[PDB]
Design a protein around this ligand. Sequence first.
Ligand SMILES: Nc1ncnc2c1ncn2[C@@H]1O[C@H](COP(=O)(O)OP(=O)(O)O)[C@@H](O)[C@H]1O
Ligand SMILES: Nc1ncnc2c1ncn2[C@@H]1O[C@H](COP(=O)(O)OP(=O)(O)O)[C@@H](O)[C@H]1O
Ligand SMILES: NC(=O)CC[C@H](N)C(=O)O
Ligand SMILES: NC(=O)CC[C@H](N)C(=O)O
Ligand SMILES: NCCC[C@H](N)C(=O)O
Ligand SMILES: NCCC[C@H](N)C(=O)O
Ligand SMILES: [Cl-]
Ligand SMILES: [Cl-]
Ligand SMILES: [Cl-]
Ligand SMILES: [K+]
Ligand SMILES: [K+]
Ligand SMILES: [K+]
Ligand SMILES: [Mn+2]
Ligand SMILES: [Mn+2]
Ligand SMILES: [Mn+2]
Ligand SMILES: [Mn+2]
Lengths: 342, 344
Amino acid sequence: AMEIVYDEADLRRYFQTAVLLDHFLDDAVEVDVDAICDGEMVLIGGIMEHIEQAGVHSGDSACSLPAYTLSQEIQDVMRQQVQKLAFELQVRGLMNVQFAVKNNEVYLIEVNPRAARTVPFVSKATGVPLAKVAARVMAGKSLAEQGVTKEVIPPYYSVKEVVLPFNKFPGVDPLLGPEMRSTGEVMGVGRTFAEAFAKAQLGSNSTMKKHGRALLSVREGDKERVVDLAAKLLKQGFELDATHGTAIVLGEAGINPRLVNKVHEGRPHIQDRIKNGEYTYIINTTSGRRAIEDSRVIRRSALQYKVHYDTTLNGGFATAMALNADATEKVISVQEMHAQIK
Amino acid sequence: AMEIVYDEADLRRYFQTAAPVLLDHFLDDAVEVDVDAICDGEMVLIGGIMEHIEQAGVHSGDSACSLPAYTLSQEIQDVMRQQVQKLAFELQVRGLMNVQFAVKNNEVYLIEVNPRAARTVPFVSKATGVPLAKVAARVMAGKSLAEQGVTKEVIPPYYSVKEVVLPFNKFPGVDPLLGPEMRSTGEVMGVGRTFAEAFAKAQLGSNSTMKKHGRALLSVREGDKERVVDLAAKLLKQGFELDATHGTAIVLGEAGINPRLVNKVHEGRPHIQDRIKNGEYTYIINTTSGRRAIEDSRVIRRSALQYKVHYDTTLNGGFATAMALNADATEKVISVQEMHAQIK
Ligand SMILES: Nc1ncnc2c1ncn2[C@@H]1O[C@H](COP(=O)(O)OP(=O)(O)O)[C@@H](O)[C@H]1O
Ligand SMILES: Nc1ncnc2c1ncn2[C@@H]1O[C@H](COP(=O)(O)OP(=O)(O)O)[C@@H](O)[C@H]1O
Ligand SMILES: NC(=O)CC[C@H](N)C(=O)O
Ligand SMILES: NC(=O)CC[C@H](N)C(=O)O
Ligand SMILES: NCCC[C@H](N)C(=O)O
Ligand SMILES: NCCC[C@H](N)C(=O)O
Ligand SMILES: [Cl-]
Ligand SMILES: [Cl-]
Ligand SMILES: [Cl-]
Ligand SMILES: [K+]
Ligand SMILES: [K+]
Ligand SMILES: [K+]
Ligand SMILES: [Mn+2]
Ligand SMILES: [Mn+2]
Ligand SMILES: [Mn+2]
Ligand SMILES: [Mn+2]
């Protein structure tokens, strides 16, 4: 039962309703690294950059392999940091390490000295059967011995996206957080991150379209960044609707969305519009226990009415890119993927 | 000291803050009309029919008006005419009289009859070329309209529009807003070949700072919400960029117009006030209804006045303002002599 408390007043609130205390790394890029250690060397299985930031459980995050935004430099740091930890803990077989990158700085989230849920993904993207190799390693065959020494960076992009069970429990707020709730995953393969992301998205049963009206209702910390997102969408032919505060900031950057009322504001409001099919896409980011609680209708509504929605700006940007891709254009077999590897 | 109460809750509100009290039904969304005439007991001469720009509810003394009428139908004017004639005799008018009417849903309501010379007489004299005070003085003294040879109503070939000037800038603590009470100190006159030109001249004469470019702030009430769309449309066609407050922006977006959203003061920064003060606006159309809303919207009008931005507090006025945008007050001048010479 992990929560993110914003302030002091916010803690009692928890405390009461409600121990490990940790500083939340806000606006950070979460990373998952899968590796093998035989006591002799460390094999980097895959470095995966999640789309959703730290604070959204890795299990519920879409992710990319290779990393789509992280610097070689930043990643080399991680690589070294994992090797250091492999030896230190005396890993023999599989291991997974979770990082957060904030302001060009690498921080340690956790070390899982065992097989992690991303293994099959990495194995498929990299064509290397990590569970088999690590098994052998555990049984006594060194990496050296196996001819498995080099880290594989495929020529193509591999993206993993999850599927969430919210539709099965309507009374639940379909919102991402530090706790994992997904049931499954899909893989998208493309020549570009945008292609891979498009394939992941469509495979995950997303109802996203390449036309219509998008609803933008983001929080403070996203208002600035949301400008670029609106630009993108307008550029893809989307019309824009926005809730008061968000419209304000857009307006201040030269973008004039059509305003929509919050439910308490009047009619029609967001719910009538969602219900009435005015939107093909919704971006709704929130912060604060309170805020979340009051915005619940947007998310429940979008779910109920099958409108594609993103609860993170990063997801938004990923979706925006995918719009320039065509998930049906080309196909490729796993064998083909694998042969293409140096 | 009178106002328009909108409901029971409001009546208390008032009745408290304030002796038999008069209670009249307020004809909302009505066109106010002024009619000046002369009766000699044998006949009735119509001096002029003026159509106010601001609706009934904005005192006639403070309304802009036009001679001849700019929206009313002849049919409706003919009623007013018969009505004036009937009143004239019944009342035994001998000399000048003035009749004020409200038109709503194609129906003519009587607001008041003033059986003496009215403040609009000079304007009508000047527009029609007929010196009403002289004519009526001769009538009171014994010379009939027939004896005088002044028996037929004169409809000029040009439009004449009267605009007023208000003293709000002399008393900054007052809310420079129109209502049932007259607060104006003077009037101007504008003459044109079209109502738009007459209006532009009257507007310019009245010391208006209106411009034909920039950004306009739109913040109107409920009853105006639907109709303000076409005005924002006229404003965009003229080249202006629009700003709007919450609910106004909502109505407009649904009509396809997307103004830039601005925050009220309680709402956030920068707000309407900050914007006005920084010279962001060149035009402001701001309509309100009910004691509270009025009280609450105060800052817009005071700021507008303070910062010299032209502002309209009525939609009818806003529309007048927009039409004038299509006219050039400085393009042509005409002398009164010439004007009267045109008279047929
Ligand atoms: N200090 C932190 N700052 C930001 N996000 C964090 C932090 N600690 C954990 N998280 C988020 O919570 C998720 C779960 O954290 P983790 O420690 O790995 O728990 P679990 O045992 O469920 O794996 C992480 O994947 C990340 O999204
Ligand atoms: N029943 C009414 N409906 C609408 N407006 C009215 C009504 N009665 C008065 N008014 C408005 O108030 C103004 C002042 O009212 P009026 O009766 O003419 O008083 P005054 O003697 O001060 O001129 C009118 O010019 C008109 O705009
Ligand atoms: N950032 C948000 O989701 C805003 C809150 C929400 N729209 C409400 O009605 O309270
Ligand atoms: N019609 C209006 O002017 C609405 C009221 C005003 N904007 C306020 O700040 O309350
Ligand atoms: N990877 C999580 C699912 C994404 C979902 N559309 C959301 O942003 O909430
Ligand atoms: N005719 C009265 C003056 C109009 C002023 N601009 C206002 O509309 O408040
Ligand atoms: Cl795991
Ligand atoms: Cl008078
Ligand atoms: Cl004062
Ligand atoms: K994450
Ligand atoms: K009037
Ligand atoms: K009277
Ligand atoms: Mn974890
Ligand atoms: Mn764990
Ligand atoms: Mn009167
Ligand atoms: Mn009177």
